Amino acid sequence: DYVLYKDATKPVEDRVADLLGRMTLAEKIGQMTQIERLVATPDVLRDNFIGSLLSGGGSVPRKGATAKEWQDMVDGFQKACMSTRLGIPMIYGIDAVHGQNNVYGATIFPHNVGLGATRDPYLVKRIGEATALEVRATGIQYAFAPCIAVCRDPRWGRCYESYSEDRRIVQSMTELIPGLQGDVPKDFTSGMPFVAGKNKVAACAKHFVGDGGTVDGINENNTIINREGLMNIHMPAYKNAMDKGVSTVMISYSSWNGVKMHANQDLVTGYLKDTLKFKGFVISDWEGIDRITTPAGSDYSYSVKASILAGLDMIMVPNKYQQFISILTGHVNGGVIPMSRIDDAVTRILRVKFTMGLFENPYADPAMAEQLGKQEHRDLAREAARKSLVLLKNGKTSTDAPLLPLPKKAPKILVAGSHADNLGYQCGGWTIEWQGDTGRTTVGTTILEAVKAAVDPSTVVVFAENPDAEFVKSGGFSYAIVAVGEHPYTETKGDNLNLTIPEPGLSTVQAVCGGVRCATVLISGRPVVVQPLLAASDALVAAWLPGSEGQGVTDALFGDFGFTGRLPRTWFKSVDQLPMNVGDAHYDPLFRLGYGLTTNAT
Template sequence: MRYPRPSAAARPAPPRIRRSLTALALAAALPSAVAALPSGARAAGAAAPYLDPRLPAAQRVRDLLGRMTLEEKAGQMAQAERSAADADPDRITSLGLGSLLSGGGSVPAANTPSGWADMVDGYQRRALATRLRIPLLYGVDSVHGHGNLAGATVFPHNLAMGATRDPALVREEQRITAAETRATGPQWVFAACVCVTRDVRWGRTYESYGEDPALVTAMETGIEGFQGRGGHDLADTRHVLATAKHFAGDGDTVFGTSTTGTYTIDQGVTITDRARFERIDLAPYVTAVRKYRVGSVMPSFSSVDWTENGVGDPIRMSAHKELLTGVLKKRIGFRGFLISDWEAVHQLPGDYATQVRTAVNAGMDMFMEPFSAPAFVATLVAEVRAGRVAMSRVDDAVGRILTAKVELGLFEHPFTDRSRAGTIGSAAHRAVAREAVARSQVLLKNAGHALPLRGTEHIYVAGANADDIGNQAGGWTLTWQGASGPTIPGTTILEGIRRRAPHVTYSADASAPAGDSDTGIVVIGERPYAEGIGDVGNGHTLALADADRAVIAKVCGAVPTCVVLDVAGRPQIVTGELPRMDAFVMSWLPGSEGAGVADVLFGDRPFTGRLPVSWPRSEAQEPINIGDRHYDPLFPYGHGLTTRG
């Protein structure tokens, strides 16, 4: 998902959350949507089949569709940003909105579990004030934990999890993420990302499990972690509706420049033939749908250009009827609903009416229109009345959305189940995250058995990323792009080392003398970024920062044993520096539990991680992937040395 950064003049100030009830009153609120209504309304609606939980979901949805007006149906197909709902408190009720979301960094005034639950429940009450009392879906980007929530457990990003080669651990990670998310109100997450990254210059590389579609498919156990056993235990309030994204080919776009000179690898064009597209880009979605029954799918911003037709006629995924309806819904059998990415339809050709009509007719079901939901509803209604969008297409879209709400149990229990809020960020959850960190570490070089360390050494630690939890968490942490510094609770890598070794000296820039230190640990890497802002060429490069190269040279030239850790969302070019290092470890973006890095450095756990992507010798070598002709990376896909724990 992309969150554009408007100008200061256009950017709305986040309003304080309006609460209609105190926390005490919320805790005592009746659990049923029907019970929450005035007694007269309860009596009038008591016989409505769509409110009867004993009936099959399909029967309930048919009954409800038969009672809805065109305007109410259009409202269900709209999703707005929470700040827009705050700016216009009547918007949820007047439009009958189907969904709200929190964009990256869009949080309640009190960014706490109760603050989130109060906010979501307040919005839900507005939805239940509509004629048919259809509850809201609330969506968030819980891509490596409930990242918008201060104090949540923050797991390693997906690329690190791909390095673990452990589907069961991924399932457990997402089970915890689901529980922490739903305990604060949201019932829907925009995860898991099942893209196949084919060029590490892409700013979303760390959101992928790897370059091999077989590895990505193996790690889709996370969908079951989100949705429950068989992917459909949604009524259990420990689970959430999952989203497979971004359909399809977003990690396989061509690197280059547009006519305006901007880099377009993100939201770019996948130039491919249908056979290769099926093998590389589409394969993970077949598993997501058929094995795990994923509840929603988010089409990509990117385009596909079939080489069979000659390069030069790319079609945006939001308009790609062949793929959205013909392949995903009909051939693969997807029964959930499609949610557009952030204002994605605005990128289609034509005026707004043409954009809406094209996307709906292509198969899009719900539209993420953060600040233009009223215009969307009015436009869709007009298009249907003009005969340019069939009512049957609208009924199909709304039926899919309502089915998800029924299966989540929202008609019976629309408000937040707060009983598990105390487990958020718990020691048990952080222990799983720490294990994930340890299992993800990839030992790429280990000359002279430099690792594991004994713990009795005098250790000299340097590098800006050694003691920066914001950098080790990366993007999608409290804000869209993430931030450096002490942004979240947890343990930095330096803190983990200090807990394990009694003799540690730290100097971020290596300006302090190394003295008689036996071992140097240099922690280099990237600063936080997300999406296109992280694309190489858009202010970023795979080359090491000058400061990182300088610290490596200084420390590795001053101590007997030099260990370098790379804290980054993708491989960086270390070809020239590698000979200076005795040991080199890819630490990825470990999240909140930096102590997991120390666990393998000191041999408390073995190194077992393996590269989920090929490591290039130079930036010019990209794209490079396993199976290429003349394959000659610095480190091949699957490389990873082992040690004994």
């Protein structure tokens, strides 16, 4: 027989319907299953008709694995899936959230909060473009990005993954989507999935919905807000994602008014699917269905029933696929979940796969391997890092000479602080490891290295991580650059009620600035208590989590470019003010949203 779904020249909808109509229940439930590479085997993938794999944070074939190693890994999994009766290719997903950040030698872009400071959606589109290439360099077809959370409380450990507390800025930054996926056609129907082809990846608007609105910024917690506030703060950017053809949506761990997002049929089916007309696939978060119950995973049968009935299409299991498949099969066999629900989930998954070209190009392109860490992409990350910097102070009094920009030629200068020569710290979370890490974890340029690469040959550069006051006073320095801030964190590990930087940080700034005039570079995922750092410093820069390209920092410090970044978030006077956002009744910021001092290029 002629087999329509295998015919590349046929419309997606026709191919979807043709394939669906041939599939067994096992093959259907298989498509709905995403498993970790760590539990995947050729037999497992074949026998269970698995639809998707992922790497969680730090799930890598080897430390320091090359782009080709990643391709061979992904292709090995694909070969197994292609060997099934129907040969449905798997889609491989990864958190490429500021570059292809799990991968050694990948370009690491500034985290979202710093991107929000740039107010440059086209820069963000270009980052999406570069990121698609570096993800494809590793054979991967699907990035779990953008996080379009609107972080309404900086005590949240994922506040750095939010472009802004202002939904309008988050909305503008949805340009990451057509960067990652390609621009949609002129004719395009809002809510339809889209990926241009083999040089682009499927994107994922996450985490639906109100992940940034949890009480006390507690990760995965309850968002307590009326429908009006949900719809005008947390929802708007999902509609922009629909208009730009986002391929997938991941559901949030968080609850809305006490209802688990992973169990909310009204929002997932009633709103996302039936109102916004989303035609791509809906994916769970990692063990998201498990966490519907308390304790998590204590009634997995209910977890499966509630999530699948709510309208989720693909489950990021990610480990115990046998239990998931068995339980879902039982629920379908007993009529508790109807076939129509299974068929809808599989329709959407196949729609995305056929649309993106996956049946035509299921294997990696070895010619793409060299896209990883490509210097052009690093130049872009460097541009983004510079554009993200917010100058908060440039002179102690109105009558002082502005410290920045600093001269490249001076007899002797000091670089200091725990964050001055620490690549892992300047990248933050989701870099190499899930939680990020310390030190030289990848290819990059620290602030110290950037300083050495920038200054006149006659400029002596001294590094001291934590020098005492006497060392500085006795040093014969013209000025100092001192970099301090937060340690890398991700998700609940970053939840923080006091928002004060670890020591030594302030003490180093005080010891340094007390002896010579100083530019303080603050590395953080969010506003932190800053008055004491401000009081000590001649100039102070909020550099956020600028990524691998530390020369973006010195590009502004030394006046190659003027400072242009503006706060995408409110800077609070103290944590007991929180939550506190632009527009609030009792708004009393240290720095308002949109604040930023400027310099001009020298």
